[PDB]
Design a protein around this ligand. Structure first.
Ligand SMILES: COC(=O)N[C@H](C(=O)N[C@@H](Cc1ccccc1)[C@@H](O)CN(Cc1ccc(-c2ccccn2)cc1)NC(=O)[C@@H](NC(=O)OC)C(C)(C)C)C(C)(C)C
Lengths: 99, 99
């Protein structure tokens, strides 16, 4: 599909058995999902955005479907204001920026 | 151009006549550039992201060239971690996400 940027590029994703809305974000190295009680082992991480760093839990090998496209990779879980799909997963669904 | 996302989508821009590197950022509402001297009138603004909010100078109707493509719009100048081109200018250069 093609997504214009007149509005936030938000699509439905499936993760951990739940559907969520998430922002397709070329400016994000990582994928950051709002607090959810995901199963399994995780690793402490801190990630930096415009205003500073936040603490998140790093889950690896997480299955995530993005707008119908299956992917698997690292998902960070923590107190983010918005669900963010980052380049680590955007590459897996073959996304590009075009102009 | 078509730009893939294995690396950060950084391009060269020209603002105030000065060359800078900037991140093409579909997850940013606004364009935010590192502190610099910029010709034009400005007013105080605050913007937020991961980590919270920062104070910026809002410059309106600023001429900026992005990878050879012309835009004239709002540029926020402040202590951003990296130079960011947001949707307000991405739409001007006709950028879309595709997969
Ligand atoms: C290498 O670090 C990163 O990649 N950091 C990423 C990051 O912060 N991405 C930023 C760009 C960036 C890159 C490197 C250092 C600092 C900033 C954006 O791609 C995503 N971020 C993610 C984000 C998007 C929306 C919101 C939000 C909050 C309340 C209501 C609506 N939206 C908060 C954070 N967007 C914003 O912060 C934008 N915010 C915005 O458009 O606000 C409306 C700005 C920029 C215009 C301030 C993540 C933490 C998400 C992984």
């Amino acid at each position: 599909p093609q997504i214009t940027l007149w509005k936030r590029p938000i699509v439905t994703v499936k993760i951990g058995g739940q559907l969520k809305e998430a922002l397709l974000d070329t400016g994000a190295d990582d994928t950051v999902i709002e607090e959810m009680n995901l199963p399994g082992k995780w690793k402490p991480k801190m990630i930096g955005g415009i205003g500073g760093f936040i603490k998140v839990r790093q889950y690896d090998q997480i299955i995530i479907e993005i707008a119908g496209h299956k992917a698997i990779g690292t998902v960070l879980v923590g107190p983010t204001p918005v669900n963010i799909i980052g380049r680590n997963l955007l590459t897996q669904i073959g996304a590009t920026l075009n102009f």
